[PDB]
């Protein structure tokens, strides 16, 4: 997007993630697995929602409309009756075409942004325990089982427990 | 016999959308007639699958 997570340093998206929009994949000692992140999913959907509702509270409840099809060739008044509609309809298209195209480029860049957000929530958890591989991947430098990384997923990770280990794996 | 706020000469349409392309004549709380017949809004992220 403008943030270059989605279709950026995040090589490509995940078709095997059916319970969520953004989420986690680990490999470790015990095995390997995947979970969705529910807040950042809900985050994104909750905007795209309101956005939609906003795009739609309009439908021209006005008001004695005028004749627009014709039985005769009449000249002057008829001409203006057509110019007036032909014009309106041109504008109201432009209006529509602009609307989707803005709405859409935003709707895209916004969800890209959320994937950044999750990524910065996670780096800041792993203060000096991890490093950014560069492809939306963290190398932790400490032994971390399926209960450990569950902490990370649910935001309950303490970084000082593991610090001493991780540091020594990294710098030594 | 049915319920529908918007009537055109072609016949009743739904005003759940914002924009109709059916007929430029209306009567009722009718979407705004436009030239296009399809304008799609994103309801999701950019889709980037494998090969």
């Amino acid at each position, epitope marked *: 997007g403008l943030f270059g997570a989605i279709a950026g340093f995040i090589e490509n998206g995940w078709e095997g993630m059916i319970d*969520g929009w953004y989420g986690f994949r680990h490999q470790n000692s015990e095995g390997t697995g995947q979970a969705a992140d529910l807040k950042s*999913t*809900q*985050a994104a*959907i909750d905007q*795209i*929602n309101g956005k939609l509702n906003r795009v739609i509270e309009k439908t021209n409840e006005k008001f004695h409309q005028i004749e627009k099809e014709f039985s005769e060739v009449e000249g002057r008044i008829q001409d203006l009756e057509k110019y007036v509609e032909d014009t309106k309809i041109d504008l109201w298209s432009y209006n529509a075409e602009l609307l989707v195209a803005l709405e859409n480029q935003h709707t895209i860049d916004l969800t890209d942004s959320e994937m950044n957000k999750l990524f910065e929530k996670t780096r800041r958890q792993l203060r000096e325990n991890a490093e950014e591989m560069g492809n939306g991947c963290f190398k932790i430098y400490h032994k971390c089982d399926n209960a450990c990384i569950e902490s990370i997923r649910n935001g309950t990770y303490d970084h000082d427990v593991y610090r001493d280990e991780a540091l020594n794996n990294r710098f030594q | 016999t049915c*319920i529908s706020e918007c009537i055109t000469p072609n016949g009743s349409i739904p005003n759940d959308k914002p924009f109709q392309n059916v007929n430029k004549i209306t009567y009722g709380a009718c979407p705004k007639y436009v030239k296009q017949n399809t304008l799609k809004l994103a309801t999701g992220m950019r889709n980037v699958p494998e090969k």
Partner: antibody
Amino acid sequence: QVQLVESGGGVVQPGRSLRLSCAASGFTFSTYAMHWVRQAPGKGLEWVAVISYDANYKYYADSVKGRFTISRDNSKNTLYLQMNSLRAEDTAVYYCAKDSQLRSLLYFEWLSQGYFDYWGQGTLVTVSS
Amino acid sequence: DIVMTQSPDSLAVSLGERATINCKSSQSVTFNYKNYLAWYQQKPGQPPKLLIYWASTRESGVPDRFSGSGSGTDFTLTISSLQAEDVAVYYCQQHYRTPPTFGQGTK
């Protein structure tokens, strides 16, 4: 303002069926996700299921999941529920509520619903022979 | 699933005096500055009408004296003083996650 007159519920014996109904006047019905909500008398109040305004998203509470089939029509502004193979602790009255949230996009099983705004008149059901 | 208390269980107050119920959940119910939590009244044999919503807002068109508060998981109703038209069943309920999870029944 809002009305939600229901229909079509009585007794039917075990392992059987009936389709319920729910009229809706006084609000643009085809833009609001819809529910079914039940109680067994005296004991705890319980959630059945839901059906997005879309008509293309439906989710259930495990106690009836795999037996039931919820749906809706939008030219005739009404909501049903299709019941197939009724079990023991089912005996209860049913109630069609209105979701508060506007065009809630129910993209997944678990997403935040909105609070139950208004409530239908009623319908009587008892799995009994 | 997710779990809702109403502790203590049943109310036993007199006519013209304050009081308080207490609703507690398992997972937190605050997200993006909004507290997803709504109650209800059920005059036995009438389908429920709406009391509080989103934590602390009044109902569609409810009595002046009720109040509601709390954040996170530790919510608290507060009726001003028990009136004549106040003799019904009650619950608390969340809508942060499907399935929306109900309570048991406050007389």
